[PDB]
Design a protein around this ligand. Structure first.
Ligand code: HEM
Length: 154
């Protein structure tokens, strides 16, 4: 697939607002993911013992993971589809070391959309949500193709 320049502008306009508070958005996204799909917490050996949302909000390690994820995804989105070099190392660690199935990438995509809709309603109307969903679908299609080349395709 291919996004138009106008679709990319809608994605990067709301992403510029996310970048005013990377750690806060990272925390909100991972807490939404763990509350909605609790099985995903099991992939994190450092904080898989957390039992409540209060514990998750106080976790320094969870906050650091949110910042690493959003910094990497922000770099991929700022390439506007020319992200082959960025995806290679991410695909290799997620297929071979962490073993993250494509369905968990779909789950965190839903969590990003929910958080952006809650925090940025004025910059995340229907057209902007549609563009963000297309950008995340492109990212998941390209990572799934790299998973297959690497021997995982999960
Ligand atoms: C937007 C999608 C995602 C991006 C851009 C992303 C990016 C990253 C980055 C940059 C790292 C550190 C470098 C590395 O190990 O490759 C990382 C580590 C990790 N990610 Fe992902 N990630 C994403 C989704 C997920 C999801 C959905 C899960 C699990 C449900 C996950 C599980 C992990 C784990 C377990 C680690 C290692 C954590 C540690 O160091 O303790 N990732 N991710």
């Amino acid at each position: 697939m291919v996004l138009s320049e106008g679709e990319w502008q809608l994605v990067l306009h709301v992403w510029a607002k996310v970048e005013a508070d990377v750690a806060g958005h990272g925390q909100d996204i991972y807490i939404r993911l763990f509350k909605s799909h609790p099985e995903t917490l099991e992939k994190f050996d450092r904080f898989k013992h957390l039992k409540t949302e209060a514990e998750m909000k106080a976790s320094e390690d969870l906050k650091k993971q949110g910042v690493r994820v959003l910094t990497a995804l922000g770099a991929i989105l700022k390439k506007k589809g020319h992200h082959e070099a960025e995806l290679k190392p991410l695909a290799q660690s997620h297929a071979t070391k962490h073993k993250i199935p494509i369905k968990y990438l779909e789950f965190i995509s839903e969590a990003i959309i929910h958080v952006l809709h809650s925090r940025h309603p004025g910059n995340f109307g229907a057209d902007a949500q549609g563009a963000m969903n297309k950008a995340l679908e492109l990212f998941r299609k390209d990572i799934a193709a790299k998973y297959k080349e690497l021997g995982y395709q999960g």
